[PDB]
Design a protein around this ligand. Structure first.
Ligand SMILES: Cc1cc2nc3c(=O)[nH]c(=O)nc-3n(C[C@H](O)[C@H](O)[C@H](O)COP(=O)(O)OP(=O)(O)OC[C@H]3O[C@@H](n4cnc5c(N)ncnc54)[C@H](O)[C@@H]3O)c2cc1C
Ligand SMILES: Cc1cc2nc3c(=O)[nH]c(=O)nc-3n(C[C@H](O)[C@H](O)[C@H](O)COP(=O)(O)OP(=O)(O)OC[C@H]3O[C@@H](n4cnc5c(N)ncnc54)[C@H](O)[C@@H]3O)c2cc1C
Lengths: 316, 315
């Protein structure tokens, strides 16, 4: 029976595993299989803001590093999707289709996946013209001094559009509806910025290009009339999905579905800790998610010690 | 006049610089000179728990990487000690020995230095037998199934002594006074743990060894009698000093001197943000300090944008 079970193999889950493993807890990590082992960063090619890599590092390369680090210090890694978590009994029950474990503490780090549009060619230009994170990719050479589209109509999209005027020559805010939904302040910010053109009643049919994004096929959401927009970048600003389905109804969540935490990583259920984007509505970065994994691991270790629950394992 | 001024070049200051720079804010970093460019990790040789380095990385090598990354994206780095911070005027004034700058926002990331004993041979065996961080170094090969001393008598030392029984064969808790000062619960853990021997009225005269720590010169703090203790590791558990002297009286601090923060990095003075060990009484890790630097940078960027203060620089 397990000291700790960690659900997730993004930056937060592996950092939690590293700390838990070095604290001799022999953590079990359910990394995800269909949910994507290694997390959201597996779908990006350039990480420039993760401190310690001044030449950049690809997303897969950083997560391959993290995974080995978790294993080196004693982590038990399962490339498996968890299907069920029962927090109404102690020890807790964690079930993947392949196995059922009991654990004194659980760390849930399942992320908050950024909504995508699902355009026919999206996979082609993903990370080569299309991104979901302006803070991360906006500084990229691909968009330097170039024309970029920002998709959405809420506070997220208006915020991203303002942010990418830091690097782009001109920014096209594509709003599917008749009017924007953001606050009056946000819309005012946007309409007072001469580098943003707002297109209303505009939907996206596809992206086109060669090796990198070169434009968009649009349509008017009123007439269906088609129109092409030349752009070399496109940012999605259509929100986020916190992946809390496994603990919905069992731990406190906010209205959008994020896990509520205090003291860094404590959920409303003692023994359950959250790490990463799953509870973070402010930052949504790899470095902060890693920091959150450490907090969650250090919290679990203290929790276990405070209740004399630690099962003893040592280094190999 | 500056968008943001960052005070400190540990993990938290550089991560704040990386984010601020990539947000085209051209941040100014006062890295410290007498306070040590590159932070506390400059004094350790093996960092094994910073995610992304499965083979380990020395402290100097990780910080040299961070510094370069701060510069690549537009950071303005000064190897200088800040001597004064005036938060009673806007924009704020930050004075080093060489220069005085105004700034719309300040990120103070000055750390919390782990107290050392200052033993004659301390520098010799430091990071080759002596550490202040059990979470970081306890798993080190140097202490596997070895006898280790833990110095102190408060809650910090007793928790560390229990923590290092995870790896050491036996732990000698060296207490200078007649009694432990930790809580009754902490003392109970210690006295009910058969792998810990508590030495009272025990002070340390020096450490000895060859290439790695081999023992301790002790004395009784009552009779002065000397006694040698064989150990291959020693952990200091004598607390921490948050480096808030520059903002003392100006931003809210707690009783121990840590900066009070809310919303990740916001201090009591709008526009002033704290990152790193300077405000963290719970974790005190490089990865969390880095995470805190990002929060502070993202907070400053939004603060400046929210007040139409951002001055334009590009890549
Ligand atoms: C295109 C794109 C580019 C980005 N670029 C950057 C960048 O350059 N720098 C940066 O700091 N941030 C970047 N981000 C944001 C960054 O990806 C996130 O902040 C980071 O991944 C959060 O880490 P996390 O571990 O909390 O969540 P995730 O990385 O999403 O990890 C979630 C993990 O939980 C697993 N999981 C989910 N459900 C289950 C289940 N039932 N059972 C088992 N396992 C499960 C998943 O398989 C996955 O491994 C980018 C995001 C996108 C979309
Ligand atoms: C021996 C030892 C080993 C450790 N090993 C690890 C490990 O392996 N992994 C881990 O995660 N953590 C480790 N730690 C803890 C880790 O070092 C800290 O958590 C981390 O350094 C804190 O980061 P920081 O940027 O907030 O503070 P610091 O690294 O302390 O940075 C403080 C910065 O502020 C500068 N500064 C201070 N005052 C001024 C001033 N007036 N003007 C200008 N600049 C100023 C200083 O020069 C310095 O650069 C170790 C600590 C010690 C003591």
């Amino acid at each position: 029976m397990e000291n700790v079970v960690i659900i997730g193999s993004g930056p937060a889950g592996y950092t939690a595993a590293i700390y838990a493993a070095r604290a001799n807890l022999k953590p079990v990590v359910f990394e995800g299989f269909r949910n994507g082992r290694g997390g959201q960063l597996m779908t990006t090619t350039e990480v420039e803001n993760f401190p310690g890599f001044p030449e950049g590092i690809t997303g897969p390369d950083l997560m391959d590093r993290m995974r080995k680090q978790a294993e080196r210090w004693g982590s038990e890694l399962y490339t498996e999707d968890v299907e069920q978590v029962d927090l109404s009994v102690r020890p807790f029950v964690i079930r993947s289709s392949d196995r059922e474990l009991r654990a004194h503490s659980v760390i849930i780090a399942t992320g908050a996946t950024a909504k995508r549009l699902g355009l026919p060619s999206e996979n082609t230009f993903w990370s080569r013209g299309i991104s979901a994170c302006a803070i991360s990719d906006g500084a990229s050479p691909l968009f330097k001094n170039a024309e970029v589209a920002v998709v959405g109509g809420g506070d997220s999209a208006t915020e991203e559009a303002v942010y990418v005027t830091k690097y782009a020559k001109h920014v096209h805010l594509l709003v599917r509806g008749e009017r924007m939904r953001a606050s009056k302040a946000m819309q005012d910010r946007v309409l007072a910025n001469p580098r943003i053109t707002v297109h209303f009643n505009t939907g996206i049919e596809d992206a086109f290009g060669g090796e990198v994004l070169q434009g968009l096929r649009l349509f008017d959401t009123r007439t269906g009339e088609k129109r092409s927009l030349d752009v070399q970048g496109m940012f999605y600003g259509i929100g986020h999905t916190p992946n809390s389905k496994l603990v919905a109804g069992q731990v406190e969540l906010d209205e959008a579905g994020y896990v509520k935490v205090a003291h860094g990583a404590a959920t409303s259920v003692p023994g359950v800790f959250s790490a990463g984007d799953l509870h973070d509505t402010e930052w949504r970065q790899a470095i902060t998610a890693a920091g959150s994994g450490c907090m969650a691991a250090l919290s679990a270790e203290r929790y276990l010690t405070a209740n004399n629950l630690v099962r003893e394992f040592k280094q190999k």
